[PDB]
C-alpha cells in the first residue's frame, strides 16, 4: 500500500544511513529526503516527520548505542520535528515517547529501563520543561503504553513502581 510502501522505503534508507556511520549532517539530509518521499505519497507533513523520527530512534535503540550518542540521535529527531512545524515541547514529548515505547516493547529489564527513562527526562528538561513535569510526562507515557498493551496486573504494578521511583527521584 502506497503509504506503507513509502514508509518501508524511508525505513530502509534511514536505517542503512545510520548503519553506515555517517555524520549528523549527512544523516539529517537523509531524513529530509525520507520525509520528502513520505510527503509526496500523501502522508501529512507532521506525520511524515514523526515516522522518520520514530524510524531513526528505534534503529538507534536496537543498535544498543551509549547514552551520549543516543541523546544526540534524540536531539536530531527533535530538530527534525521542529523543522516540520511541531512545537519544540511537543517534539521532545514525541521523541521521548518513541524511545520509551520501543524500550517497553523490547521487554528490556528494569535497571536499563530506568536509564532509558532518565534519558527521556534529560531531553525533556533540556528543551525547557521542569524536571517534575518531564518525569511526570515520562511516567505518563510508560503507564499509558503498558496499559494499552493489555499487560497483566503484575506487570502493571512493576511499571507503576518504576514510575514512582522516577518521580520521587526527580522532584517528589
Amino acid at each position: 500500500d502506497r503509504e506503507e510502501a513509502a514508509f518501508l522505503a524511508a525505513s530502509i534508507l534511514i536505517q542503512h544511513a545510520h548503519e553506515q556511520g555517517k555524520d549528523d549532517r549527512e544523516l539529517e539530509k537523509i531524513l529530509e529526503i525520507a520525509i520528502r518521499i513520505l510527503e509526496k505519497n500523501g502522508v501529512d507533513r507532521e506525520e511524515a516527520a514523526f515516522l522518520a523520527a520514530s524510524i531513526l530512534i528505534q534503529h538507534a535503540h536496537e543498535q544498543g548505542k551509549d547514552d551520549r550518542e543516543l541523546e544526540k540521535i534524540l536531539e536530531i529527531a527533535i530538530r527534525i520535528l521542529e523543522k516540520n512545524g511541531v512545537d519544540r515541547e511537543e517534539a521532545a514529548f514525541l521523541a521521548a515517547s518513541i524511545l520509551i515505547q520501543h524500550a517497553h516493547e523490547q521487554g528490556k529489564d528494569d535497571r536499563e529501563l530506568e536509564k532509558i527513562l532518565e534519558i527521556a527526562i534529560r531531553i525533556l528538561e533540556k528543551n525547557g520543561v521542569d524536571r517534575e513535569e518531564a518525569a511526570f510526562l515520562a511516567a505518563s507515557i510508560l503507564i499509558q503504553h503498558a496499559h494499552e498493551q493489555g499487560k497483566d496486573d503484575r506487570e502493571l504494578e512493576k511499571i507503576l513502581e518504576i514510575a514512582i521511583r522516577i518521580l520521587e527521584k526527580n522532584g517528589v
Binding site: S11, S54, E62, F93, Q101
Partner: peptide, 12 residues
C-alpha cells in the same frame, strides 16, 4: 494527561 498514538513496530 495527553493521549498517545500507538507505536509502529520497526521493520526487521
Amino acid at each position: 494527561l495527553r493521549p498517545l498514538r500507538p507505536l509502529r513496530p520497526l521493520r526487521p
